[PDB]
Design a protein around this ligand. Sequence first.
Ligand SMILES: [Zn+2]
Ligand SMILES: [Zn+2]
Ligand SMILES: [Zn+2]
Ligand SMILES: [Zn+2]
Ligand SMILES: [Zn+2]
Ligand SMILES: [Zn+2]
Ligand SMILES: [Zn+2]
Length: 207
Amino acid sequence: SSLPKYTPKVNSSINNYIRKKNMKAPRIEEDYTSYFPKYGYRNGVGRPEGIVVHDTANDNSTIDGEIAFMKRNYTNAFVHAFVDGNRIIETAPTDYLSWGAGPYGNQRFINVEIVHTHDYDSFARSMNNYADYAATQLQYYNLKPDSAENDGRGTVWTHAAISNFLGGTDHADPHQYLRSHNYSYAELYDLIYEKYLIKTKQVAPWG
Ligand SMILES: [Zn+2]
Ligand SMILES: [Zn+2]
Ligand SMILES: [Zn+2]
Ligand SMILES: [Zn+2]
Ligand SMILES: [Zn+2]
Ligand SMILES: [Zn+2]
Ligand SMILES: [Zn+2]
């Protein structure tokens, strides 16, 4: 195409594998629940400020199990979306907040969960799927990707970054989870950034 290829800012054999395989994220599915609460973000309904990277609390759950448990326990916690190696499922409308990152995170950011995977390919697909969903939301909300990890400013936040800069929570996901699969947030962010650039037609698509 007329567009330049993205130059990766982070060395990543897993990202290389994703790009070379030309992985295609699945369609975003809606699975909403009538009794979930619908409250605006701190700047209003329809005004999220960014997106949070979570991994699921359990290492052995399925996306279906996670969702069923959440519907039963929504007064304790619920999130906007789950991704695994096969599916992207939005469980609450992104124009309203969700209950996944403590009081301060919840007022600002879309909460997205990475379901755990147990093989190389499934893990790589789940990373592609998270990154694709995140880039889609940033594009839809006219937000630009900016990692908050080191200075507490921007639109892409790990739960760890929320804990560090905002408080109201102490979870450090997804760092240890990604490390256990020989990956990292730095690599995930580089993938989000590239996918955002592809979607906004600034760099060439894969193929
Ligand atoms: Zn709908
Ligand atoms: Zn979390
Ligand atoms: Zn495991
Ligand atoms: Zn949506
Ligand atoms: Zn495993
Ligand atoms: Zn920045
Ligand atoms: Zn957690």
